[PDB]
Amino acid sequence: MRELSRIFKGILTCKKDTINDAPKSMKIKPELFLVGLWRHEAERVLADKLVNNKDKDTVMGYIQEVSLESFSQIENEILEKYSSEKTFLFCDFLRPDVINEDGIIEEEAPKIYEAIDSLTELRKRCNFLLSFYNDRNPSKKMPLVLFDDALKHLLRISRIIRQPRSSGLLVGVGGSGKQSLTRLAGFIGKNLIQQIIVTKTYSDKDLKEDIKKGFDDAGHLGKQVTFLMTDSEVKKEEFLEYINMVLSTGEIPNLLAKDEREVWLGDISQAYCKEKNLGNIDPPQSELWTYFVDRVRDNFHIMLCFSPVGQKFRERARKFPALFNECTIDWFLPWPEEALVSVAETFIKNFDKLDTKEETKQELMKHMGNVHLMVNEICDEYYQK
Amino acid sequence: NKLAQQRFVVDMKKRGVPVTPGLELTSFLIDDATIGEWNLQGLPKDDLSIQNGIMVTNSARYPLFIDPQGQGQNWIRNKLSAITTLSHPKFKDMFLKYCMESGLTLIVENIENEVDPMMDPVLELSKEFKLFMTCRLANPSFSPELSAKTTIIDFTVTQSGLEQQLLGKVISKEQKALEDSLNQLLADVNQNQKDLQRLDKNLLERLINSQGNLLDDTELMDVLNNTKTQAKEVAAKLIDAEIKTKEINEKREQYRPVAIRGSAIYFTMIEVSLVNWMYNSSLEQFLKLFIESIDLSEKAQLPSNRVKNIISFLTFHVYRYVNRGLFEKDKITFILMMAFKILTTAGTISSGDVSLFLKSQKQISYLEDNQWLNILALSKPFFKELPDLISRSENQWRNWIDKNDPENFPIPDFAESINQEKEIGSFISLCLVRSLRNDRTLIATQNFISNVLGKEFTDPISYPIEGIWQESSNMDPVLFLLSAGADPTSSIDELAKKKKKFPCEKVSMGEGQERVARQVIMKGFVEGGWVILQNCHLGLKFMEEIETLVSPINQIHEDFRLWITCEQHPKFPLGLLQKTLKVTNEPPKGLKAGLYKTFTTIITQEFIDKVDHSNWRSLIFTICFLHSIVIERKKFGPLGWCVPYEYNYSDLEASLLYIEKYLTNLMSTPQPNSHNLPISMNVVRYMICEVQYGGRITDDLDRELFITYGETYLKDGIFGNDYFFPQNPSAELIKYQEYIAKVPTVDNPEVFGLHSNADLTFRLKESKEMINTVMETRPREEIVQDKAKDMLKNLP
Amino acid sequence: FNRIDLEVLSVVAMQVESITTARKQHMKKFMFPEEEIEIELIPTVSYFI
């Protein structure tokens, strides 16, 4: 029953932004946008964590059938517009509004609630942003190629990271780029990021001090954060136990209560005087800790990225129930031929200075994709024999 | 090349895009001048090394080599360098900053899939700095992402290049004058290839130096003539290409069979490493053995006859070297593999027929279902042509199948001419022998090994420890792969008292013994004593240090040896396994073998101190024979002993000490011997029964069984004149040696009193494991659960 | 005696062998491993596991 709650949690947004169909009105009745939101929601909460694209195709068939079942009063309109397999209502937060850099770069916080379907301006703002990330980080060294599926994956990371009290397990073979994608996805969301470094001596205290700093960023200071554990950031089980309880409770036994909880809480009640607003009169003591756990769990997102293969992943999941339970799950299939030819032309356009031949370039990019798909098979055969 | 090339060209043909016929990848990539320059820098002259050098040249990213032999390490050591190991406290801090801020190139040579994490973020800011790093142990398990960062290159030597390398080294050592002629003509013809290049330079000069008014230069006529002159020396070079490709070639044809054999031998002894760890050794040790063999016996006169003598001697030398490390159950197997790997090239024996020899009824009625399985096994060239009325004659071969030793005297006449030819007739006879009678596989194995390789191989070996000491220089240790109930420690100490004049020092591994071992080793270094490490199978962290210690750098006083002992623990790094001397001291197999060994343990002063040639000489002989019989009884299995017991010599000299006390204090009161003694030998029965040898025995039945053996062998008296059930001695030492000499090699179990048929079961299980060993060296959730699903509705 | 760590047995092997060789010679004074001071002996000792 969790996923039903997640579906509704996604639906409940836009107290009046849904009403504002007037700017778009792209053959849209007010209800049409609503059912499209329902569709996108159901897809992203159910039509994600499935291994083969066929499984996806059958859930979308289910969705279309059920939409026709309930929507027995405009069924032809939904068939014309949103039940069609063509792309519909890509929902996003930063693309739809543009800062416009009037007097300062971040002129105004973009409107945040919704966006519409389009791919061009999506890619143009993505490239814009890529240049920004290049000059923000010294030695960024991030030749990220943005093709349709990559754009969708960044969108999904955004969907999970943004939500209050959310987190998402990301699965996929190495090279799928999830670790690369999350850096941008976090920078856009203003969230700070820190990774764990395994010293020459592999031990436990690093975890504790790092989590303390993380809470105090998401607690006392109250900033927005994110956490980027991966397979490199596990050396034994125990780390998984401590993080497990962090997902569940968030109180570390006597890490914050080593004669410190009261000084840190006392550094916070000034915000409490207006935040809970007890008529600006008084407060209590334990309730401050209640509000503190509220704040830190409200602003400590956890991004986990595991391998799908090996031995340890499956029984690690079985060891700790909350891990696969609370977090959203998303698959990354290997790139299909469309993506590869797209990358080939992105790299051949800038490189077709001397190799001038019409009607042969397109076959060139095609054949290059073919070469890649093939070295996959040769790899398989070598390991097999 | 093959798979990838056919793959890419079929892609191109299906795509219909145009592509050129012919690969010639190396030719239009790099000018051959740099190829030759590298070949001066130690790059192997053959194809695979050529593409490898290209691959390093491209240097898309920093590389990482799979390096079973060491071609890349030497190449980089020479290519432009002419070093700092990974494991060093200074390396992680010092060597990094030096290389990263001044470009020293920081080579590394100890990757074992374990990465100090600080290695990585250095990998991915001086602009004068590169870095090459390589692995040692083959078959890596690199992480996916370690493949993402760095390029991977395999320098797994092929046999093909290997025979050329051995060809060069034999041309060196057999007579240097051959190399003088070789390198002389080779330098000349290399320079003449460069002279063709100079002709090309002259053509280019003729063509574009003037870049106008070529014709008005009437000296162009002279230039044209000059072109002709250069072609003339190429003609001499052309002649030299013939004079080369025959003369040196025949000088090489005298030896390139040898190189072929050498390469074959090496690729045999590779695979035993996969049969079990600790049978691991370099190419370098093999190279020393090869060069030595040339020195040992090669040149007398009559060079072709000496080529044949290579083929005789080298094989035996390398063979014995590997046997010194081998275990009993793997003795027969290594020789068997050597035979096959020899014949997979010359005789062109089919791998399919090999698998026929390893793996495998309506027609016949008399023979057994156990036999009919084998008829269908053989049935599925002329194997599927002569199971008919020919085989089903049933005229004289019934006696044949009854006769023991089917192969030798009653030979099959099914194919008499085929067996006569013998080029493959051995292998045919053996496919027959295995398929019909797996019982007598192993002696047949010894037989055709003796045939195709010589009977010298199928003959006993026993390592003279005094002889073995001559091998051990100070700078190499002596390993010992031991088995339960056997230790040479007493003999090592005995030798250290005989030739060396001092007792050795000993340190047992464990916990908290590193520094103790190190300080005693330093004392040995300065002085020249001997050290006995013990129990290396645990506490392996100290082992890796030893290889660094035993080095030319830290100088060591002469006469210092090291002796190492350990047991079967994988995850034992091969730093010393790659550089050591491996010896095996499990007890000998045969009855005569164990008897002879026992007759070289406590001898020549036990035996020679008598003061009586009559009685207690006979008692020694009795007890020794008893020892050697009851030990060997266990070969059969539960029929002979309920569980295995580890009798050794300790009980023997215990009994000897007792009975010598008994006789000395008996005859201490004897002023005169009636006939040499007046013993009442019934107490000795009870003692050798229940006290000395009673320690191991956990069963009840074994007690009275062993008492019975005592009864039948002692007889309750020293007859002096009778036939042992098995001869009886005279009273001289070398006569005992001869007595051993006339003993048969293989006996029959009625010597123990035990029935002939026992033999049968032993051989079967023995055969059943043997092939399985080599069968490993070759390169679920489905309807089964539905079968169980149907089962569970059948139990009551 | 068996329910004991393996390496401890490894070093105990040394200690007991030293004492055995010491007692064998009938030597009044002997040297013990790991323990620098010299130490004496009395014959009627024994070991059992």
Ligand SMILES: Nc1ncnc2c1ncn2[C@@H]1O[C@H](COP(=O)(O)OP(=O)(O)O)[C@@H](O)[C@H]1O
């Ligand atoms: N979309 C992409 N286009 C090009 N290169 C990529 C892409 N995604 C990943 N890479 C390459 O893979 C490397 C590792 O990416 P990473 O984010 O770790 O993938 P994963 O998380 O699947 O291991 C990066 O350094 C980058 O060079």
